[PDB]
Design an enzyme around this catalytic site. Sequence first.
Site, PDB file in Angstrom:
ATOM      1  N   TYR A 111     -20.041 -27.112 -73.505  1.00  0.00           N
ATOM      2  CA  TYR A 111     -21.017 -26.196 -74.088  1.00  0.00           C
ATOM      3  C   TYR A 111     -20.379 -25.121 -74.976  1.00  0.00           C
ATOM      4  CZ  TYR A 111     -25.329 -24.033 -75.469  1.00  0.00           C
ATOM      5  OH  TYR A 111     -26.376 -23.576 -76.255  1.00  0.00           O
ATOM      6  N   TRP A 113     -21.120 -22.503 -78.990  1.00  0.00           N
ATOM      7  CA  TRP A 113     -21.678 -22.297 -80.326  1.00  0.00           C
ATOM      8  C   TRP A 113     -20.913 -22.874 -81.494  1.00  0.00           C
ATOM      9  CZ3 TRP A 113     -25.895 -19.853 -83.091  1.00  0.00           C
ATOM     10  CH2 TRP A 113     -27.039 -19.802 -82.298  1.00  0.00           C
TER      11      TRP A 113
HETATM   12  N1  LIG Z   1     -23.708 -12.328 -68.432  1.00  0.00           N
HETATM   13  C1  LIG Z   1     -24.155 -13.126 -69.449  1.00  0.00           C
HETATM   14  N2  LIG Z   1     -23.457 -14.239 -69.748  1.00  0.00           N
HETATM   15  C2  LIG Z   1     -23.957 -14.989 -70.813  1.00  0.00           C
HETATM   16  C3  LIG Z   1     -25.098 -14.656 -71.558  1.00  0.00           C
HETATM   17  C4  LIG Z   1     -25.828 -13.493 -71.210  1.00  0.00           C
HETATM   18  O1  LIG Z   1     -26.910 -13.087 -71.746  1.00  0.00           O
HETATM   19  N3  LIG Z   1     -25.285 -12.744 -70.130  1.00  0.00           N
HETATM   20  N4  LIG Z   1     -25.415 -15.386 -72.790  1.00  0.00           N
HETATM   21  C5  LIG Z   1     -25.162 -16.863 -72.522  1.00  0.00           C
HETATM   22  C6  LIG Z   1     -25.499 -17.673 -73.805  1.00  0.00           C
HETATM   23  S1  LIG Z   1     -27.177 -17.869 -74.191  1.00  0.00           S
HETATM   24  C7  LIG Z   1     -24.509 -18.306 -74.492  1.00  0.00           C
HETATM   25  S2  LIG Z   1     -24.902 -19.393 -75.846  1.00  0.00           S
HETATM   26  C8  LIG Z   1     -23.005 -18.277 -74.038  1.00  0.00           C
HETATM   27  C9  LIG Z   1     -22.058 -18.105 -75.240  1.00  0.00           C
HETATM   28  O2  LIG Z   1     -20.832 -18.904 -74.944  1.00  0.00           O
HETATM   29  P1  LIG Z   1     -20.025 -19.681 -76.118  1.00  0.00           P
HETATM   30  O3  LIG Z   1     -20.939 -20.406 -77.068  1.00  0.00           O
HETATM   31  O4  LIG Z   1     -18.930 -20.445 -75.385  1.00  0.00           O
HETATM   32  O5  LIG Z   1     -19.303 -18.416 -76.888  1.00  0.00           O
HETATM   33  P2  LIG Z   1     -18.575 -18.324 -78.333  1.00  0.00           P
HETATM   34  O6  LIG Z   1     -17.798 -17.030 -78.271  1.00  0.00           O
HETATM   35  O7  LIG Z   1     -19.521 -18.546 -79.469  1.00  0.00           O
HETATM   36  O8  LIG Z   1     -17.504 -19.541 -78.251  1.00  0.00           O
HETATM   37  C10 LIG Z   1     -17.473 -20.628 -79.267  1.00  0.00           C
HETATM   38  C11 LIG Z   1     -15.991 -20.930 -79.461  1.00  0.00           C
HETATM   39  O9  LIG Z   1     -15.940 -21.983 -80.484  1.00  0.00           O
HETATM   40  C12 LIG Z   1     -14.814 -21.744 -81.367  1.00  0.00           C
HETATM   41  N5  LIG Z   1     -15.057 -22.494 -82.601  1.00  0.00           N
HETATM   42  C13 LIG Z   1     -15.941 -22.165 -83.644  1.00  0.00           C
HETATM   43  N6  LIG Z   1     -16.024 -23.120 -84.564  1.00  0.00           N
HETATM   44  C14 LIG Z   1     -15.150 -24.132 -84.119  1.00  0.00           C
HETATM   45  C15 LIG Z   1     -14.824 -25.411 -84.697  1.00  0.00           C
HETATM   46  O10 LIG Z   1     -15.288 -25.940 -85.759  1.00  0.00           O
HETATM   47  N7  LIG Z   1     -13.873 -26.127 -83.948  1.00  0.00           N
HETATM   48  C16 LIG Z   1     -13.352 -25.664 -82.734  1.00  0.00           C
HETATM   49  N8  LIG Z   1     -12.482 -26.518 -82.084  1.00  0.00           N
HETATM   50  N9  LIG Z   1     -13.653 -24.481 -82.160  1.00  0.00           N
HETATM   51  C17 LIG Z   1     -14.537 -23.776 -82.923  1.00  0.00           C
HETATM   52  C18 LIG Z   1     -14.837 -20.209 -81.529  1.00  0.00           C
HETATM   53  O11 LIG Z   1     -13.647 -19.645 -82.099  1.00  0.00           O
HETATM   54  C19 LIG Z   1     -15.167 -19.727 -80.066  1.00  0.00           C
HETATM   55  O12 LIG Z   1     -13.993 -19.398 -79.294  1.00  0.00           O
HETATM   56  O13 LIG Z   1     -22.803 -17.093 -73.170  1.00  0.00           O
HETATM   57  C20 LIG Z   1     -23.721 -17.151 -72.051  1.00  0.00           C
HETATM   58  N10 LIG Z   1     -23.272 -16.185 -71.029  1.00  0.00           N
HETATM   59  N1  LIG Z   2     -25.608 -10.197 -82.989  1.00  0.00           N
HETATM   60  C1  LIG Z   2     -25.943 -11.288 -82.179  1.00  0.00           C
HETATM   61  N2  LIG Z   2     -27.088 -11.938 -82.341  1.00  0.00           N
HETATM   62  C2  LIG Z   2     -27.326 -13.023 -81.492  1.00  0.00           C
HETATM   63  C3  LIG Z   2     -26.413 -13.426 -80.509  1.00  0.00           C
HETATM   64  C4  LIG Z   2     -25.210 -12.703 -80.351  1.00  0.00           C
HETATM   65  O1  LIG Z   2     -24.305 -12.973 -79.479  1.00  0.00           O
HETATM   66  N3  LIG Z   2     -24.999 -11.617 -81.241  1.00  0.00           N
HETATM   67  N4  LIG Z   2     -26.714 -14.562 -79.607  1.00  0.00           N
HETATM   68  C5  LIG Z   2     -27.808 -15.496 -80.055  1.00  0.00           C
HETATM   69  C6  LIG Z   2     -28.367 -16.249 -78.857  1.00  0.00           C
HETATM   70  S1  LIG Z   2     -27.541 -17.713 -78.293  1.00  0.00           S
HETATM   71  C7  LIG Z   2     -29.503 -15.863 -78.244  1.00  0.00           C
HETATM   72  S2  LIG Z   2     -30.176 -16.821 -76.862  1.00  0.00           S
HETATM   73  C8  LIG Z   2     -30.290 -14.609 -78.659  1.00  0.00           C
HETATM   74  C9  LIG Z   2     -30.424 -13.643 -77.415  1.00  0.00           C
HETATM   75  O2  LIG Z   2     -31.828 -13.455 -77.176  1.00  0.00           O
HETATM   76  P1  LIG Z   2     -32.198 -12.717 -75.786  1.00  0.00           P
HETATM   77  O3  LIG Z   2     -31.729 -13.499 -74.574  1.00  0.00           O
HETATM   78  O4  LIG Z   2     -33.665 -12.328 -75.892  1.00  0.00           O
HETATM   79  O5  LIG Z   2     -31.299 -11.392 -75.968  1.00  0.00           O
HETATM   80  P2  LIG Z   2     -30.541 -10.296 -75.009  1.00  0.00           P
HETATM   81  O6  LIG Z   2     -29.798  -9.399 -75.960  1.00  0.00           O
HETATM   82  O7  LIG Z   2     -29.792 -10.909 -73.854  1.00  0.00           O
HETATM   83  O8  LIG Z   2     -31.793  -9.465 -74.357  1.00  0.00           O
HETATM   84  C10 LIG Z   2     -32.974  -9.123 -75.143  1.00  0.00           C
HETATM   85  C11 LIG Z   2     -33.447  -7.709 -74.711  1.00  0.00           C
HETATM   86  O9  LIG Z   2     -33.915  -7.805 -73.318  1.00  0.00           O
HETATM   87  C12 LIG Z   2     -33.670  -6.509 -72.693  1.00  0.00           C
HETATM   88  N5  LIG Z   2     -33.680  -6.725 -71.233  1.00  0.00           N
HETATM   89  C13 LIG Z   2     -32.632  -7.104 -70.367  1.00  0.00           C
HETATM   90  N6  LIG Z   2     -33.040  -7.201 -69.118  1.00  0.00           N
HETATM   91  C14 LIG Z   2     -34.424  -6.896 -69.131  1.00  0.00           C
HETATM   92  C15 LIG Z   2     -35.396  -6.873 -68.056  1.00  0.00           C
HETATM   93  O10 LIG Z   2     -35.218  -7.125 -66.852  1.00  0.00           O
HETATM   94  N7  LIG Z   2     -36.681  -6.521 -68.542  1.00  0.00           N
HETATM   95  C16 LIG Z   2     -36.986  -6.244 -69.847  1.00  0.00           C
HETATM   96  N8  LIG Z   2     -38.296  -5.899 -70.137  1.00  0.00           N
HETATM   97  N9  LIG Z   2     -36.072  -6.267 -70.884  1.00  0.00           N
HETATM   98  C17 LIG Z   2     -34.812  -6.625 -70.426  1.00  0.00           C
HETATM   99  C18 LIG Z   2     -32.307  -6.053 -73.270  1.00  0.00           C
HETATM  100  O11 LIG Z   2     -32.124  -4.632 -73.139  1.00  0.00           O
HETATM  101  C19 LIG Z   2     -32.335  -6.616 -74.759  1.00  0.00           C
HETATM  102  O12 LIG Z   2     -32.777  -5.584 -75.696  1.00  0.00           O
HETATM  103  O13 LIG Z   2     -29.579 -13.843 -79.683  1.00  0.00           O
HETATM  104  C20 LIG Z   2     -28.964 -14.681 -80.717  1.00  0.00           C
HETATM  105  N10 LIG Z   2     -28.474 -13.747 -81.743  1.00  0.00           N
HETATM  106 MO   LIG Z   3     -27.245 -20.001 -75.499  1.00  0.00          MO
HETATM  107  O   LIG Z   4     -27.048 -21.331 -74.436  1.00  0.00           O
HETATM  108  O   LIG Z   5     -27.651 -20.193 -77.403  1.00  0.00           O
END
Ligand SMILES: Nc1nc2c(c(=O)[nH]1)N[C@H]1C(S)=C(S)[C@@H](COP(=O)(O)OP(=O)(O)OC[C@H]3O[C@@H](n4cnc5c(=O)[nH]c(N)nc54)[C@H](O)[C@@H]3O)O[C@H]1N2
Ligand SMILES: Nc1nc2c(c(=O)[nH]1)N[C@H]1C(S)=C(S)[C@@H](COP(=O)(O)OP(=O)(O)OC[C@H]3O[C@@H](n4cnc5c(=O)[nH]c(N)nc54)[C@H](O)[C@@H]3O)O[C@H]1N2
Ligand SMILES: [Mo+6]
Ligand SMILES: [O]
Ligand SMILES: [O]
EC number: 1.7.2.3
Length: 767
Positions: A111, A113
């Site tokens: 998994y 991005w």
């Molecule tokens: N506590 C908490 N944990 C969370 C979340 C949260 O809300 N709270 N958010 C969750 C969500 S929705 C997500 S998506 C995950 C994010 O987790 P990831 O998607 O694992 O995070 P990234 O930092 O985007 O890691 C992508 C890696 O791909 C590498 N990369 C980019 N392009 C290429 C390429 O072409 N080739 C290769 N080989 N490598 C490449 C980048 O340098 C980077 O190190 O975190 C999750 N974890």
């Molecule tokens: N700059 C930037 N943009 C991104 C990303 C990134 O890493 N950086 N990640 C991308 C990805 S994979 C995703 S899924 C989306 C994330 O989309 P989301 O999962 O919706 O985003 P989050 O920032 O985790 O949280 C959204 C809001 O929920 C609020 N929140 C947290 N807990 C609670 C709760 O219990 N109740 C309520 N009412 N609000 C709560 C937080 O304060 C925050 O403002 O963003 C995408 N875009």
């Molecule tokens: Mo995700």
């Molecule tokens: O994700």
């Molecule tokens: O995601």
Amino acid sequence: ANGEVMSGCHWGVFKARVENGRAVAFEPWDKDPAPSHQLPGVLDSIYSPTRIKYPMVRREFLEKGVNADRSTRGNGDFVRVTWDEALDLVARELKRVQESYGPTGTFGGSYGWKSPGRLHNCQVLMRRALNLAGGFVNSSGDYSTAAAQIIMPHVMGTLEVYEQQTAWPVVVENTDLMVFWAADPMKTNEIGWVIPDHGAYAGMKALKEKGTRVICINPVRTETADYFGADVVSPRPQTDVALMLGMAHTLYSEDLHDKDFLENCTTGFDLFAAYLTGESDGTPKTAEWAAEICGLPAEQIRELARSFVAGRTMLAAGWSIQRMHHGEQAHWMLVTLASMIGQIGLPGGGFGLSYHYSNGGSPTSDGPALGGISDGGEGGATSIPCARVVDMLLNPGGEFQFNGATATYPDVKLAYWAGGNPFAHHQDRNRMLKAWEKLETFIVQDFQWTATARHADIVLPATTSYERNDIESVGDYSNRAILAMKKVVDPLYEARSDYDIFAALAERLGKGAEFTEGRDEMGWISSFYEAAVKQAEFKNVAMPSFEDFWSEGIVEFPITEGANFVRYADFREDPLFNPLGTPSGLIEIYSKNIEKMGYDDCPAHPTWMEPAERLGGAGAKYPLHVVASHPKSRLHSQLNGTSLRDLYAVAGHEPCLINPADAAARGIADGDVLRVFNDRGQILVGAKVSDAVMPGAIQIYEGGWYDPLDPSEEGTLDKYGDVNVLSLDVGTSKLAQGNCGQTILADVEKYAGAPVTVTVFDTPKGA
Ligand SMILES: Nc1nc2c(c(=O)[nH]1)N[C@H]1C(S)=C(S)[C@@H](COP(=O)(O)OP(=O)(O)OC[C@H]3O[C@@H](n4cnc5c(=O)[nH]c(N)nc54)[C@H](O)[C@@H]3O)O[C@H]1N2
Ligand SMILES: Nc1nc2c(c(=O)[nH]1)N[C@H]1C(S)=C(S)[C@@H](COP(=O)(O)OP(=O)(O)OC[C@H]3O[C@@H](n4cnc5c(=O)[nH]c(N)nc54)[C@H](O)[C@@H]3O)O[C@H]1N2
Ligand SMILES: [Mo+6]
Ligand SMILES: [O]
Ligand SMILES: [O]
Ligand SMILES: OC[C@H]1O[C@@H](O)[C@H](O)[C@@H](O)[C@@H]1O
Ligand SMILES: OC[C@H]1O[C@@H](O)[C@H](O)[C@@H](O)[C@@H]1O
Ligand SMILES: OC[C@H]1O[C@@H](O)[C@H](O)[C@@H](O)[C@@H]1O
């Protein structure tokens, strides 16, 4: 070379300036309505101290292989090797595991991005090679909407989260009240899975100019609230379902609910109403009952409910609230509340689950779809829900439940990760470190020295998108254009494209021609373009020859009917002629299919259940909720190891947003080094004192790079600030088995130990 080159990335289209073969600036695209402030960091990631120069093997694995002491992964002892030595070792290990264990021995979920692009998709390319080796165990779902994407098909009959929204122009013209529920659209629309169009910013600017009332229901006063002058309502985190129930009870008791919509478009309202009134369980779900749980005054709860039925209301909800224990209940209850309001299918009314993600609502063009390379099968069981990866390693052959089915965990021995960072993204870092010892072999492929690369047995240096050619769509929902992602600079150091790495592994297995199909880079790219041209010809959409497209760098598609799209309009017009994909053909407030599963943690109608740990919960052991949300100045962990880190680091650590009342009670001042801790782990952060976060909660964004003080000591302090050192690793419920990354309680104190030095942004010794 010297000149300008246009290309794209997850942060948007850009124009690079190149001088003497080195990129010196990534400038915004002239047509972008809201360019990303992160572009300078994207550029720096090509060249920073943490760029991976060479193939490396950790010393213990180079000497002992499968017989290595597994506890020393992550201790920094790496040996530089040639590409030939590294590729031979990887091929030998892939073949050994297939011969000894079959396909269940290799985990290929990987998994993450990665980067956009139809050809250079590192995960699809990895799976293409693993299928030629004999197969692997995959993963299902994602970390974003694991719970919502499983409950929505049972309720609305579709996944709902990744589907086009009522168009932005229709919302601006007709909505009287916009409610952002657990969403920060000004922050999160900066990113796209394909190249983003930033179309949400055009819609939000029009909404602001009209003056329409906005409310955001969130523990933090965000950039979205500041832009719109919104009213901010802050329930205790993890209490939104109780708040929604109190609102629903108010509508029902005051006879404000839409009886006609409920009768014609839903099933199970009578059973749900018996729960709402307390007839079925002895507990009426009144505004006062809800106030005690969520912390807001009862009259405020009643007034909000009344305001939602006074005019045309849109409930635009984000995803943090389903990335928590019992996450399935959040959007199921939101749809039930929207059904009682009765505006689903009206212009500017109802609900929307993607106004905050990848510019949902930006009108869809009339252009063709663009395809890409396939895995030869992106955007024990033979697959697991993605966040069950550690449970799988700790319980080989053990049973698990998932969405009505029973299965057993496969016995995995080797894991290959490309384009992902599990040592940032997965929950409970200390538990994960011990579980990883069950793997015989761990291979990591990236261009940056993340915590995942630092914990590998074998590290292979990939190139960035800026060191190769590709093709991709612009606008996740709009499909406004197809872009040529042109090479900016030649491959740096000894880095190789993921395509070139996987083709060389396929050649070593005697399956080279099957992998490449005899094509070259431009041959693959032109094949994808020509298939789009044929589709467009059948729909009377004009496109240039491949040569003319490549020279110009882009082809734009026009918007016509997409500007008028209203979600659920056909269903509302005639629910009998246009039924939903549910058993009844209607919205399932009560689900007989879920009743038959008999899951204690996911009942047959939306229900309030206490989470494992929460602010205000009986028996809670720690005092503050940790809002572990998405970062403003990174994409997850991406760009942490660049000069962009200087915009937000506090005393060299990840920032911690803390309310002045909680800080003063602990003798904490702005800028101080702090220790954040619970029974699972401990990290350092730097204090940022602000009343933007509610009393009782602190904000520490996900994605920080884990930097252990002493890698040989269990439970060691993290010197930088990876919030997942504090999280819990359990399923949402037996229905979706999603991650609970935002279910976190901890305490904080002024750090009192000896000075330490962060080293995770430095070049590793020997690299
Ligand atoms: N506590 C908490 N944990 C969370 C979340 C949260 O809300 N709270 N958010 C969750 C969500 S929705 C997500 S998506 C995950 C994010 O987790 P990831 O998607 O694992 O995070 P990234 O930092 O985007 O890691 C992508 C890696 O791909 C590498 N990369 C980019 N392009 C290429 C390429 O072409 N080739 C290769 N080989 N490598 C490449 C980048 O340098 C980077 O190190 O975190 C999750 N974890
Ligand atoms: N700059 C930037 N943009 C991104 C990303 C990134 O890493 N950086 N990640 C991308 C990805 S994979 C995703 S899924 C989306 C994330 O989309 P989301 O999962 O919706 O985003 P989050 O920032 O985790 O949280 C959204 C809001 O929920 C609020 N929140 C947290 N807990 C609670 C709760 O219990 N109740 C309520 N009412 N609000 C709560 C937080 O304060 C925050 O403002 O963003 C995408 N875009
Ligand atoms: Mo995700
Ligand atoms: O994700
Ligand atoms: O995601
Ligand atoms: O130095 C020559 C080598 O360069 C590498 O970039 C190529 O992947 C490899 O095929 C070639 O032999
Ligand atoms: O060469 C750069 C130019 O390429 C064009 O194809 C794009 O439409 C334009 O916005 C950009 O400035
Ligand atoms: O009690 C059973 C549950 O236990 C949890 O620890 C596991 O995370 C989850 O997958 C399982 O359904």
